[PDB]
Design a protein around this nucleic acid. Structure first.
Ligand SMILES: *OP(=O)(O)OP(=O)(O)OC[C@H]1O[C@@H](n2cnc3c(=O)[nH]c(N)nc32)[C@H](O)[C@@H]1O
Ligand SMILES: [Zn+2]
Ligand SMILES: [Zn+2]
Lengths: 408, 852
RNA sequence: AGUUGUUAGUCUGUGUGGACCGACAAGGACAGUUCCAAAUCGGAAGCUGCUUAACACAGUUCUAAC
């Protein structure tokens, strides 16, 4: 390991194509070195699942899994670091910061990257981003343990009365990406109708389905991008239609938040999707069926704006990641900022909405705006602003209704 | 109501300014200024008639549609598409149609590359045509109207007209209104009948929703249309973004002869190298067939993989944000797309074989010149430890590693004895660890055999009477002035378009004539290099296909590879001989008759050489392809016969218009600089280099060589500032900016990462000393044109360009933005220091009499 | 689609034009005492103690109204 990498004023994006021991081999040694160098260190993880994986891979070293107490190096989810930073408690001074999955899309993740970069620029930090796709990546077909046999084809969007045999005729397990649970249900119904054991995954069903996936019984697995992160398959083919959805802002007069329809995925997303296969040099049939060109200008998405809100409201003008800089207003005064943190943490409001509310200085209790919305500002309940996240799924609607009622 | 019609209405409901801006939100647009100028002037070559050329290039490049055989274009218009297509590998015959007439474009006859095979026909409406057998079809017919129904109907008529032409052939058809239902259905029926997809071209402005139906592609029409419409909607305001620019297309010149184009390679000579490459990647060696290589022989391909704005400078040079050139310099891309484009338009040519008289003349001249150049020095082999020194003292780091390694040296020895036998095993270079050892080794061998050209300064001004090797920027001015003192006509400095691509075989032979002076041991190796890796070259390049990037293997015989050691020496040599010949023709010693006859008597020419050669040589400054020549009389501005026949065509001027020569030597451009003369307080004169500052500013706002490392980017900024304080102090803006930067970075952050790659930069500013003393050393102490050696004491006797002169060279003085900047640089520095942290901070502002 | 600007003023260069010349300098810029420059004075000219023109032709001068 290049020991000079541990100098302050040094932030390095390292990488290792999926597996490779990036977590299985390198990370414990890195923490070992930092411990030997006696460095107060932080580790940032994208999601609870990845956190558990790192916990498994961190057997032996003292890590404050946010435990007993009085360690030196801590580990936590990225958004946790974001929120803890937002809360007015002086953030602990870590000398070194390791951050996994740095190509993540959570606004909290973007803001964490920005803050870490700025702290390095302050000259009192050392940063290590261990991800396979930086901002500025365009290599959607990067390295792999085994070469990936690509092919562009006619990936069907709905169920097909007949045809598309190349889909089912495979001798190997197929991992297929779908943009919504409903579409997954449809395609799974069709595949099972052809007598292929299938398995559908989603944001909620992942906990119950993942271990079943860890068994060897299944053959054809449909999923959304939840499987895009840390989901070991040992599959054979991937069908990645390069169609997806995302919560994007939309101005069109009233600036709002809309859950996008089917859409070509970002270059990095498609890269990760393709890399969800071909993680073993033993295998050969690393087939990848793509039917789209990755999106051109993701500059319209909203998580950039929300991350800007988080960074600006954070307690020197706050500045993003250099390569992500290409995408000081949203900062609010004391009481309004506290209200924003509250509405995010207590009311479970997604970041954009909470910032919009806190801009106008409505204290957490008041819910006048929840019905003061215009005629067209209705739902199928008239909030001052529209965000399909607040009413996309029935569970989301129920939670938002609870919040608007004052029950949350 | 489909989304497309929603957007159509919404657009209809806009106003002049709103529509005017909205049509240009976040789109690529090609610079058509220069082309407009050249066409208004009346040029015939190197110019896309319209913006159609780039538009079709965007498709052709991605292979979404591939011209082949006979190509028929309908609605050819001014004919951008036809001309662009003419210069492609498979294309054989191009016929373009249009109704022509009032309110309609007309073909503009030109003579860009491949013009000889283009037949454009006005006065013929495509609608009434007897569909002919087409190998490739192009159609760009569309008449937009505010009424969507009208566009839909026109589209329908178009599709009806163009159905009977698709007989299993590559095609691209414009579709103007794709968001009308009947249109969608007809497209779907045609797709089922033929296949192919529907695509949007980023060049097309926001004001329309056109797409193109193309042969090679699949997908879903409806969803794509919806995506386009959603994009446009999102782009109505979208906090409007300025449009990105790209460089226009070139189309060479001259007639295109297919039968003489492709090359037959000496497979016995390069076979071992090709075979070794194929063996090394024996998995992915897939011989392609979409290889666009006209004049380069092909060998196969194999799988392969794939600017940043320095913050420190950006924060301290705010006023230059609106400056178009400063931004333009930044938005240049080196992706495989760019490299392929450059290769297509620049290197895949073929220069005609010269007249025999020219060949004999050049032979004579080259012999004489080489004999002169060796009047005192004598070649020697180079040595390994010298190569070690050159590497160590300055891929640099890995290079040091490899040189200090051992196995590399054994590899070198083995390949070397192969060379002694007369074959070459890894001498292959790339047009940008084991294979990397091979590459570095080949460089080493070239250094060993041809390093004496540089290590011994064969071309120093003292030795070669014209070269300026080893002078550096601070002396080219003085050299130019001394030229200006010699009697004669005006001064000319003609830049040769793509010099490297313009080296015919005879030039290489002449350059090889130097082997008539080495010692057998050396001669064998030099012959090896010349005849195996210079006259038969093998190159790896990158190409993007609709699967990813792949390396392609090509080979050729001409066109010296620009990465090679000894390139500078040979370039200077060939340039010298060329200019000498041009002077000869100017003085009348050479005529057209002398060029024509296969055997012109050598006595006259040799006499002229041995009598006046050194004298003529002392009238030139030559550095690579850059030349400054002062002939005795202005007939030199007409000696274009020999120059063209040798194939060194000038840049940006018609092939027979006379040269245009300056008289004031402070205007003649040279190595991308001009030079100014200044008077100091004592009256002592200085000669300093000046270039339009915008280039300087942009080049110091680009943080290439560093992904993201503020500690690095700051040091690069400091390095740029010091170079500014050493070679450009006479520009006010530059001096202010430099002082600010130097006071805005820790006073012990030693810079690195060379600020320039020119050979004419000795890099006196990469030290860590105090500028003033080093400035004294550079310009006062060690300047031979400095009679009075009284050192300057403070940055106040240091001169300044005259106000109007500084303005004339791009300075921002006199404008309010600069004024406020000038006032508040103190806050700017404070902010940047804050960003940096707690390291020391000296203040260089009080050096100017504005901050005391 | 491509092709694309149009009219007014301003700003460059020329030409005609007696048509400007000096003195000074508020202020401005610049940071090298380095350049501009309103006012004011005087000179001259013209028609009678007031004016320093006027217009043209081209600028890839810009600014605005279709
Ligand atoms: O790209 P291009 O088609 O050359 O731009 P056009 O000027 O030709 O526009 C064609 C298309 O656009 C609409 N349009 C033109 N000019 C307009 C304007 O000033 N205001 C509005 N609202 N629309 C304008 C027109 O419908 C035409 O079909
Ligand atoms: Zn060799
Ligand atoms: Zn200049």
């Amino acid at each position: 390991l290049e020991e000079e990498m541990f100098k302050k004023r040094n932030l390095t994006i390292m990488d290792l194509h999926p597996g490779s021991g990036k977590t299985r081999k390198y990370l414990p040694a890195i923490v070992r070195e930092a411990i030997k160098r006696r460095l107060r260190t932080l580790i940032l993880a994208p999601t609870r699942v990845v956190a558990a994986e790192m916990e498994e891979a961190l057997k032996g070293l003292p890590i404050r899994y946010q435990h007993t107490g009085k360690e030196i190096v801590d580990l936590m989810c990225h958004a946790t670091f974001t929120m803890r930073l937002l809360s007015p408690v002086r953030v602990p001074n870590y000398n070194l910061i390791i951050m996994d999955e740095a190509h993540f899309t959570d606004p909290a993740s973007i803001a964490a990257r920005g803050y870490i970069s700025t702290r390095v620029g302050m000259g009192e930090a050392a940063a290590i981003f261990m991800t396979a796709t930086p901002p500025g990546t365009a290599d959607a077909f990067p390295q792999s343990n085994a070469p990936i046999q690509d092919e562009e084809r006619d990936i069907p969007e709905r169920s097909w009365n007949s045809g598309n045999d190349w889909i089912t005729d495979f001798a190997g397990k197929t991992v297929w990406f779908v943009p919504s649970i409903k579409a997954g249900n449809d395609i799974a119904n069709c595949l099972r109708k052809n007598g292929k054991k299938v398995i559908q995954l989603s944001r909620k069903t992942f906990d119950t389905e993942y271990q079943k996936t860890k068994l060897n019984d299944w053959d054809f697995v449909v999923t959304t991008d939840i499987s895009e992160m840390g989901a070991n398959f040992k599959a054979d083919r991937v069908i990645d239609p390069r169609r997806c959805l995302k919560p994007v802002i939309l101005t069109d007069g009233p600036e709002r938040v809309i859950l996008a329809g089917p859409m070509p995925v970002t270059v990095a997303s498609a890269a990760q999707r393709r890399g969800r296969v071909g993680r073993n040099p033993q295998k050969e049939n690393d087939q990848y069926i793509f039917t789209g060109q990755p999106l051109n200008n993701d500059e319209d998405h909203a998580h950039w704006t929300e991350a800007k809100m988080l960074l600006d409201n954070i307690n020197i003008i706050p500045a993003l990641f250099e390569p992500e800089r290409e995408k000081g207003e949203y900062r609010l005064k004391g009481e309004s900022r506290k209200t924003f943190v509250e509405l995010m943490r207590r009311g479970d409001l997604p970041v954009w909405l909470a910032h919009k509310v806190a801009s106008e200085g409505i204290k957490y209790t008041d819910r006048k705006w929840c019905f003061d919305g215009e005629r067209n500002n209705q739902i199928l309940l008239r909030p001052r602003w529209l965000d399909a996240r607040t009413y996309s799924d029935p569970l989301a609607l129920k939670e938002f209704k609870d919040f608007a009622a004052g029950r949350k | 109501e489909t989304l497309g019609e929603k957007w159509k209405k919404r657009l209809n409901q806009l106003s002049r300014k709103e529509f005017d801006l909205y049509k240009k939100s976040g789109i690529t647009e090609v610079d058509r200024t220069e082309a407009k100028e050249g066409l208004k002037r009346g040029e015939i070559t190197h110019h896309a008639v319209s913006r159609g050329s780039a538009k079709l290039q965007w498709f052709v490049e991605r292979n979404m549609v591939i011209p082949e055989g006979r190509v028929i274009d309908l609605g050819c218009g001014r004919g951008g598409w036809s001309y662009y297509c003419a210069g492609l590998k498979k294309v054989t015959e191009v016929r373009g149609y249009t109704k022509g007439g009032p309110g309609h474009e007309e073909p503009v006859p030109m003579s860009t590359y491949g013009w000889n095979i283009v037949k454009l026909m006005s006065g013929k409406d495509v609608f009434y045509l007897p569909p002919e057998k087409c190998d490739t079809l192009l159609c760009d017919i569309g008449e937009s109207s505010p009424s969507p129904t009208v566009e839909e109907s026109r589209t329908i008529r178009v599709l009806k007209m163009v159905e009977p032409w698709l007989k299993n052939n590559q095609f691209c058809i414009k579709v103007l209104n794709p968001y009308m239902p009947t249109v969608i259905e007809h497209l779907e029926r045609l797709q089922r009948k033929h296949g192919g997809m529907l695509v949007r071209n980023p060049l097309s402005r926001n004001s329309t929703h056109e797409m193109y139906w193309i042969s090679n592609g699949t997908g879903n029409i409806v969803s794509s249309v919806n995506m386009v419409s959603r994009l446009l909607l999102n782009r109505f305001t979208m906090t409007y973004r300025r449009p990105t620019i790209e460089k226009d297309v070139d189309l060479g010149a001259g007639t295109r002869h297919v039968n003489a184009e492709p090359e037959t390679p000496n497979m016995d000579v390069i076979g071992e190298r090709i075979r070794r490459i194929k063996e090394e990647h024996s998995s992915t060696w897939h011989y392609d067939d979409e290889n666009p290589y006209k004049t380069w022989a092909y060998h196969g391909s194999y799988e392969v993989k794939a600017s940043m704005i320095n913050g420190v400078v950006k924060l301290l040079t705010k006023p230059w944000d609106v400056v178009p050139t400063v931004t333009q310099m930044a938005m240049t891309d080196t992706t495989p797309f760019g490299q392929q484009r450059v290769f297509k338009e620049k290197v895949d040519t073929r220069t005609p074989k010269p007249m025999p008289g020219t060949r004999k003349v050049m032979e004579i001249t080259a012999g004489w010149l080489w004999r002169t150049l060796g009047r005192n020095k004598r070649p020697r082999l180079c040595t390994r430890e010298e190569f070690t020194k050159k590497v160590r003292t300055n891929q640099w780091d890995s290079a040091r590693a490899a040189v200090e390694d051992e196995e590399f040296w054994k590899l070198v020895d083995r390949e070397r004895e192969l060379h002694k036998q007369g074959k070459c095993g890894s001498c292959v270079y790339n047009m940008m660890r084991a294979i990397w050892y091979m590459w570095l080794g080949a460089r080493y061998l070239e250094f060993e055999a041809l390093g004496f050209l540089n290590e011994d300064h064969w071309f120093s001004r003292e030795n070669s009477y014209s070269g300026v090797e080893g002078e550096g920027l601070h002396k080219l001015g003085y050299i130019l002035r001394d030229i200006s003192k010699i009697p004669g006509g005006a001064m000319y400095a003609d830049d040769t378009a793509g010099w490297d691509t313009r080296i015919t075989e005879d030039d290489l032979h002449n350059e090889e004539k130097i082997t008539q002076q080495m010692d057998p041991e050396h001669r064998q190796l030099a012959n090896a290099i010349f005849k195996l890796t210079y006259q038969n070259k093998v190159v790896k390049v990158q190409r993007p296909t609709p699967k990813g990037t792949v390396m392609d293997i090509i080979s050729r015989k001409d066109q010296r590879g620009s990465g090679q050691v000894g390139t500078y020496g040979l370039n200077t040599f060939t340039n010298m001989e060329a200019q000498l010949i041009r002077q000869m023709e100017g003085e009348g010693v050479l005529s057209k008759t002398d060029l024509e006859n296969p055997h012109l008597l050598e006595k006259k020419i040799t006499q002229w050489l041995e009598t006046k050669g050194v004298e003529r040589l002392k009238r030139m400054a030559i550095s690579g392809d850059d030349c400054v020549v002062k002939p005795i009389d202005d007939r030199f501005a007409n000696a274009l016969l020999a120059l063209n026949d040798m194939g060194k065509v000038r840049k940006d001027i018609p092939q027979w218009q006379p040269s245009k020569g300056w008289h004031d030597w402070q205007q003649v451009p040279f190595c991308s600089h001009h030079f100014h003369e200044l008077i100091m307080k004592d009256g002592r004169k200085l000669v300093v280099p000046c270039r339009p500052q915008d280039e300087l500013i942009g080049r110091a706002r680009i943080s290439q060589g560093a992904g993201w490392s503020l500690k690095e980017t700051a040091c690069l900024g400091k390095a740029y500032a010091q170079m500014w304080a050493l070679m450009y102090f006479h520009r006010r803006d530059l001096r202010l900016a430099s002082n600010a930067i130097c006071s805005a970075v820790p006073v012990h952050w030693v810079p690195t990462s060379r600020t320039t790659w020119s050979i004419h930069a000795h890099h006196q500013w990469m030290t860590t000393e105090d500028m003033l003393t080093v400035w004294n050393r550079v310009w006062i102490e060690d300047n031979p044109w400095m009679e009075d050696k009284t050192p300057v004491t403070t940055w106040e006797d240091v001169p300044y360009l005259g106000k109007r002169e500084d303005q004339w060279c791009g300075s921002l003085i006199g404008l309010t933005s600069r004024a406020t900047w000038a006032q508040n640089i103190l806050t700017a520095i404070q902010q940047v220091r804050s960003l940096i942290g707690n390291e020391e901070f000296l203040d260089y502002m009080p050096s100017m009499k504005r901050f005391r």
